[PDB]
Assembly symmetry: D2
């Protein structure tokens, strides 16, 4: 039984404990792939899909050629482009298909998933392993909320790293944002 604001603290504490189990060799590699790929696609189902979109948007703001798998105006992938798949289970059929198709086209696949031996993980060129396996990790939140929150924060850290690599600062960064609404 507790205050709404106290629940915010409990989440932040789950996030802090959980995020502090993510490995950095893989992450810094993801930034490097984003920097060298001509197009970047993000992907996810459900709420993870929302976090993908949030990451693609910020990538576009920074001037990258970023897209989201499954949207009306998604362009074709070409050889060497990157696909970033956020999936807790690593078993979502649609996402398994996206990874396979990417690979068939000689795209590069990065997967952020709990289980690296999952269907999606086994297709990936790069795996960023997220916490939450049967080994470890506490959460009082609904089914996949912690993973989804972790996805967002991790995406937004990759944004910071990209900013650093590009010598960009928050106060003065030019953003390519929509201007018709």
């Amino acid at each position: 039984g507790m205050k709404t604001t106290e629940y915010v603290a409990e989440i932040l504490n789950e996030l802090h404990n959980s995020a502090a189990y993510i490995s950095n060799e893989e992450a810094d590699q993801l930034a490097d792939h984003i920097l060298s790929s001509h197009q970047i696609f993000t992907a996810g189902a459900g709420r993870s899909g929302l976090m993908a979109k949030s990451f693609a948007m910020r990538l576009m703001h920074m001037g990258f050629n970023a897209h989201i798998v499954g949207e009306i105006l998604t362009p074709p992938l070409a050889e060497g482009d990157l696909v970033i798949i956020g999936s807790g289970s690593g078993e979502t059929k649609s996402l398994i298909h996206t990874a396979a198709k990417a690979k068939s086209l000689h795209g590069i696949v990065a997967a952020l998933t709990i289980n690296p031996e999952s269907s999606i993980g086994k297709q990936a060129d790069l795996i960023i392993r997220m916490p939450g396996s049967p080994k470890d990790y506490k959460t009082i939140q609904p089914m996949g909320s912690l993973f989804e929150q972790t996805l967002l924060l991790f995406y937004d850290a990759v944004i910071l790293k990209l900013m650093e690599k590009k010598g960009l600062d928050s106060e003065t960064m030019f953003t390519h944002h929509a201007n018709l609404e």
Copy 2:
């Protein structure tokens, strides 16, 4: 009282009678604006919005720099870009705003609307007048169905005209379609 297939014929007959009141000077101009603008944005609310998206998609397939107002990855408009607004009423507040903002940025606005003296029509550089004013036009369909259907067919005719101008044929046209699903 009638067969489902008979209702299809009645719709086609409303469409045929209705579409045969559209003026061609304005239309051919829209194609010409699409051909010369570096970016094209489409826009609409509700079902008209769906037709906008359907038109933007086909524009992208043909290699144009096409976007839809209000989507996650919509880029900024620049001077000289085109905004194509489909609105029956010409009074939707959000669309009035999009037109005004476009104009402030020195974009070009084309409006497909029933009432050229509407809020959206008065902002437009180009008006394609659609049938259905108090003067004319029969429809046994729900509120805005005929206008929405007419929008689709008109968009798809502009596609044909663009194909013609570009010396493209349906059987052999290269399309830039999504390839990850």
Copy 3:
């Protein structure tokens, strides 16, 4: 080569052919199913998907419990619910999945497609066959000057809007007070 208004005429010309081809017997079953199923789900990919959204919207307007497969707020399907899938080829991988999954849940699947023997057509309880088969082509019948599946998508829209009319007929529905009022 041709006025834009002349292309409209051509497009109309092609849709008239498509309408005469459609078997009303299957079409009429569709509306019956919409009227009896507690939930209705529409689906498609790309433009066909846009036409599925347009239909679901009008079903909602009529007071049906209508949904679109794949959206954030889509609820679970329960036994006896209807899923309506528009697919030209009947081979789109996501939609094969949706059809097979619906069937496994004992949903009723209605497929609108060119190929009744396609992967999606074979899962369907009801098939609404649209024109454009390699057969109707080589044998003189079907011709489109439009790209890709444009004629099919157009036919979908028009067919779905015709189904709305049949529904309104069957009911007493104007009473479109089910329209959004926010934003």
Copy 4:
């Protein structure tokens, strides 16, 4: 300059500041309103809009009649319904419209914003003030190394997920059988 995992730590550091700032009294009213209103509508633009969708999805999962302003299938708001608007600046033109329209329909409007005197904040029945005012800046309190409204959007997500917990507490809800099963 810093490891990606070090940036995660920094982001967390900023969210902790934002949580201590939030007045629980207003937060608690939000959940009360969610529990009493027959329909709940969420809204936002851009990323904030994504967080509004994430919240609406979880409300649906809990069996609430939840909707997202601006979607194809969004139903009309009726008197007494709740609209929850996330906006940093409280000046986004569409959202000003949504708030004023909701109020005119006698909906209840809850605004989550940095500026309670913003256009949206002035329409709100309930305001959940988030940090980041020019004041909290110049006076030492608020600092972000992240672009644009990233910290605010993150705070929104986390705040909405906290509200879910309070709702689950208040109820007996696991019983997330309200999850999509098609596709």
